[PDB]
Design a protein around this ligand. Structure first.
Ligand code: NAP
Ligand code: AKG
Length: 737
């Protein structure tokens, strides 16, 4: 009676086959119903194309149901990481469902007819981050629990040594990006607004109309595609002169519209010699550089070997005139520019800094790198961290402090809801935003090919943000900084509200300040290295970047964080860490039947999820399920029963067993409730005694390839046997309820 559990993609999906059955049994002992909501990428494709499925094979639209549940005050969701698909990934999902019999329409890369444009629009809703903006209806409280830090200090993860002579650096545009042109206003009263275009010849197009609440913040900006292509050529030339490897770090997944244009311009510029010679044949075949260089590799298959061989050689000649670039997989030849979703800035840049500031090249060796991030707004903080490591060495998890995050995200704050307000200018002219009484609010001169966009942030999420920041500052006794850039128009609007709403709360004994981004990360890092903590209070995007960046230094992986979402209706969402769906863990499983995914983020969320039920439902026992799990996670940390990444020990599957065994024990041991004490004694010691052959039956699989049938919609019977192979263990768990 209250817990919704999320079935997602890739590695967390496989973890859930082993872990969810154990959760359902234990939870049942407190009279708790544990629902499964399918928000996977293939599951969402079926849910939106019901009209193309036989009624018997239709499925229920779980995202829509989960989106309504998030607005109810009874919500209790456990949210595991899920895909934000690029176009290549969507094309792969469609192709797998089609080969299973579902007649779902192909993705229309060029839609000419009106019926083609409606299939495109239906698919557009499924692309990108379709889940998180719909679920996140409170702000974000993300922090490392004390026990997790204690574990990291006793068992430090590897950290690459940093040389003061390193040549690695981050490069970003100086002029010509969003940072350069940003404008922002705050509405004094509710009202309508119009997004207008006035060309040079004088033609007017009313792009969109919007209704905004009273205290609503609205921003406006554009990027010059001319200066972008210019920038790309300069970064490539510089790498060629200096001998340092080129790399690209954007967020083409979440930034559905803008960053593929950026990604595609990087491709056009990099392989410019190929696109210049074969421009017409490529436009004929429909190659789209916004999908990566893979687009060319794919579409030339329909051509004759004589002529495609001519193209494979002209690409080789680009790689001899351009600088070396980073590799996603050196063995298979998969490049940084291959598909847009491989290298995602928030995961990739912490990986590089942790690895001595280096990435892998053509030869399989790591080397110094220029990390290209065209947009200046959030690029600059990585430069401050790169220089800090050059000067002070690599971070030390043994003595390090902590940087938690309180994050503004409710109701699609800032850049997250901006995709319906984003256009690629088709002519020279100006873009403006007018009050409908004619008053011009914001204005930009633009040129053909440039990207223009606007963003909305509402006053209620902001009040909740400031309030959550003050609470955390009091609850721990730790200074907090609002990262607001004084040269950003949007951040100046935010600062008026923050300065105002801080006065609505009692600041006695509290250290709260406001700084631009570079000063804040510098102050945070200077405190960090002296063993002290700082809370970062940031907007929506920095919430993402920093809860990847600092946790990977401190803990080795994002997945070992608490991530609590107090929903504004009164409920709660508990995300299983601050990481992603670890697609590389899938390659290892299909190939040699080891899953290194660490489910600690799940255990941590679950224990908070059960205490929430206890409080809201006054379910005394379910509250005890919680602290028995805290103990359960405690002994897993204390006894280092997490997965190692060596193929002769326990993996993800074995770790769940060890969690179940101490969770059973701590309940068989306690005397607080004689019901549950007797309830879990038959399972407790049964798991204990049989421990060695459970582990042997788990570990007996390693080595052998695992044929789960499919990737995006794997075969459930097949997949479930691959993940629950200790038939000894299964009936111990089956025979609980
Ligand atoms: N739903 C969400 O809230 C969310 C958040 C972020 C990303 N994503 C999505 O997830 C997908 C992949 O993201 P990504 O490739 O950018 O990076 P990622 O999933 O964050 O992880 C990349 C690396 O992080 C490490 N890692 C992450 N979780 C781990 C865990 N539980 N245990 C051990 N190591 C872990 C792994 O390192 P090793 O190789 O060293 O083992 C992995 O290769 C994308 O499709 C993206 O859209 C979703
Ligand atoms: O990682 C986060 O916290 C945000 C994830 C995200 O931005 C997305 O892809 O939707």
């Amino acid at each position: 009676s209250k817990i919704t559990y999320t079935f997602t993609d890739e590695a967390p999906a496989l973890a859930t086959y082993s872990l969810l059955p154990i959760v359902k049994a234990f939870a049942a002992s407190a009279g708790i119903d544990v629902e499964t909501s399918d928000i996977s990428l293939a599951g969402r494709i079926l849910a939106n194309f019901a009209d193309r499925l036989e009624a018997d094979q239709r499925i229920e639209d779980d995202l829509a149901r989960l989106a309504v549940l998030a607005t109810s005050p009874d919500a209790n969701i456990i949210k595991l990481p899920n895909i934000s698909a690029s176009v290549p990934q969507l094309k792969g999902a469609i192709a797998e469902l089609q080969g299973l019999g579902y007649k779902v329409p192909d993705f229309p890369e060029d839609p000419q007819t009106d019926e083609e444009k409606e299939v495109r629009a239906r698919y557009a809703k499924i692309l990108g981050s379709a889940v998180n903006p719909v679920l996140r209806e409170g702000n974000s409280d993300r922090r490392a629990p004390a026990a997790v830090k204690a574990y990291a200090r006793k068992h430090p993860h590897s950290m690459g040594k940093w040389s003061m002579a390193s040549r690695s650096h981050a490069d970003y545009m100086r002029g010509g990006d969003f940072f350069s042109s940003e404008q922002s206003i705050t509405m004094a009263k509710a009202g309508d607004v119009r997004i207008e275009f006035v060309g040079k010849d004088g033609k007017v197009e009313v792009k969109k109309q919007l209704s905004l609440q009273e205290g609503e913040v609205l921003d406006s900006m554009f990027m010059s595609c001319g200066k972008l292509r210019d920038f790309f050529e300069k970064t490539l030339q510089d790498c060629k002169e200096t001998g340092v490897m080129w790399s690209l770090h954007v967020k083409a997944t979440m930034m559905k519209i803008s960053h593929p244009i950026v990604f595609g311009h990087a491709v056009s510029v990099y392989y410019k010699d190929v696109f210049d010679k074969w421009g017409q044949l490529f436009e004929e075949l429909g190659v789209n550089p916004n999908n990566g260089i893979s687009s060319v590799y794919d579409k030339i298959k329909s051509l004759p070997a004589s002529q495609q061989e001519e193209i494979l050689h002209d690409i080789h000649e680009v790689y001899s005139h351009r600088p070396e670039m980073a590799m996603v997989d050196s063995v298979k030849g998969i490049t940084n520019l291959h598909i847009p979703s491989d290298v995602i800035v928030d995961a990739s840049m912490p990986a590089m800094i942790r690895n001595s500031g280096q990435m892998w090249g053509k030869d399989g060796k790591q080397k110094d790198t220029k990390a290209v991030m065209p947009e200046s707004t959030y690029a600059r903080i990585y430069q401050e961290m790169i220089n800090f490591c050059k000067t002070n060495g690599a971070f030390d998890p043994t003595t390090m402090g902590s940087v938690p995050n309180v994050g503004l995200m409710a109701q699609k704050a800032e850049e997250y809801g901006s995709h319906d307000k984003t256009f690629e200018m088709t002519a020279d002219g100006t873009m403006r935003v007018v009050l409908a009484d004619g008053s011009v609010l914001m204005q930009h001169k633009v040129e053909t090919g440039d990207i223009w966009r606007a963003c909305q942030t509402k006053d209620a999420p902001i009040r909740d943000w400031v309030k959550l920041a003050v609470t955390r500052a009091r609850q721990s006794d730790t200074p907090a900084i609002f990262w607001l850039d004084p040269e950003r128009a949007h951040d100046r609007e935010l600062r008026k509200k923050v300065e105002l709403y801080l006065k609505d709360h009692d600041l006695t004994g509290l250290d709260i300040s406001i700084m631009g981004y570079n000063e804040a990360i510098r102050v945070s890092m200077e405190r960090l290295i002296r063993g002290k903590d700082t809370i970062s209070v940031t907007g929506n995007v920095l919430r993402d970047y920093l809860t990847d960046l600092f946790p990977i230094m401190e803990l080795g992986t994002s997945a070992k964080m608490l991530s609590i979402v107090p929903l504004m209706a009164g409920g709660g969402m508990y995300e299983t860490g601050a990481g992603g769906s670890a697609p590389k863990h899938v390659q290892q499983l299909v190939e040699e039947n080891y899953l290194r995914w660490d489910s600690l983020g799940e255990f941590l969320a679950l224990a908070v999820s059960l205490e929430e039920t206890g409080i809201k439902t006054g379910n005394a026992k379910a509250k005890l399920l919680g602290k028995a799990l805290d103990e359960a996670t405690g002994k897993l940390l204390d006894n280092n029963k997490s997965p190692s990444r060596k193929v002769g020990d326990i993996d993800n599957r074995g770790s769940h067993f060890y969690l179940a065994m101490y969770w059973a024990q701590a309940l068989a041991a306690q005397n607080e409730d004689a019901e549950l004490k007797a309830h879990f004694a038959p399972l407790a010691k049964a798991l204990t005694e049989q421990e060695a052959t459970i582990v042997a039956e788990l570990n007996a699989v390693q080595g052998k390839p695992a044929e789960i049938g499919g990737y995006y919609r794997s075969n459930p019977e097949l997949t479930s046997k691959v993940m629950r192979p200790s038939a000894t263990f299964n009936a111990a768990i089956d025979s609980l309820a």
